[PDB]
Amino acid sequence: MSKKILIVESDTALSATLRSALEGRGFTVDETTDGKGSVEQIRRDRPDLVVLAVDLSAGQNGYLICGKLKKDDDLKNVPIVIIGNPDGFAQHRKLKAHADEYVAKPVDADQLVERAGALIGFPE
Ligand SMILES: [Cl-]
């Protein structure tokens, strides 16, 4: 009865750290550095939770990707945790297309594991 997480994050060092911690708890975890294809990957692979960074590579932006996901009638139900500079969190919460949760960088991997479990439950 696997719980699946996708990390959209071009900081591969951080993504690996987060992945190991989540996998340690029993989550299945995939990673992508590509924000451009992220929405369609989410539609294909159907993760139970998305961890989405703000500052992504090749001009991609987590708030904009979150916008597309939360305006999509099919995908707006998939929980999104935004990670990044906490400065912009308060503003984005006010938007209709806000994420489900916001975790400030520096992200504590153990803390994120607990926040993931609060959103989608823990592996059993
Ligand atoms: Cl970021």
Numbering used by the authors: 1 to 124
Give excerpts from the publication.
The Myxococcus xanthus FrzS protein transits from pole-to-pole within the cell, accumulating at the pole that defines the direction of movement in social (S) motility. Here we show using atomic-resolution crystallography and NMR that the FrzS receiver domain (RD) displays the conserved switch Tyr102 in an unusual conformation, lacks the conserved Asp phosphorylation site, and fails to bind Mg2+ or the phosphoryl analogue, Mg2+·BeF3.
The largest differences between the structures in the two crystal forms occurred in the conformation of the β3-α3 loop, part of which was modelled in two conformations in the hexagonal structure. Excluding these residues (54–62) from the comparison reduced the Cα RMSD to 0.45 Å. Although the backbone conformation was very similar, this molecule was poorly ordered in the present structure, and virtually missing from the electron density when different cryoprotectants were used (N. Echols and J. Fraser, data not shown). Nonetheless, the independent structures in the tetragonal form provide an important control for the effects of crystal packing on the overall conformation. The crystal contacts along the α4-β5-α5 face varied in the four independent molecules in the two crystal forms, suggesting that the similar side chain positions of critical residues, including Tyr102, faithfully represent the predominant conformation of the RD.
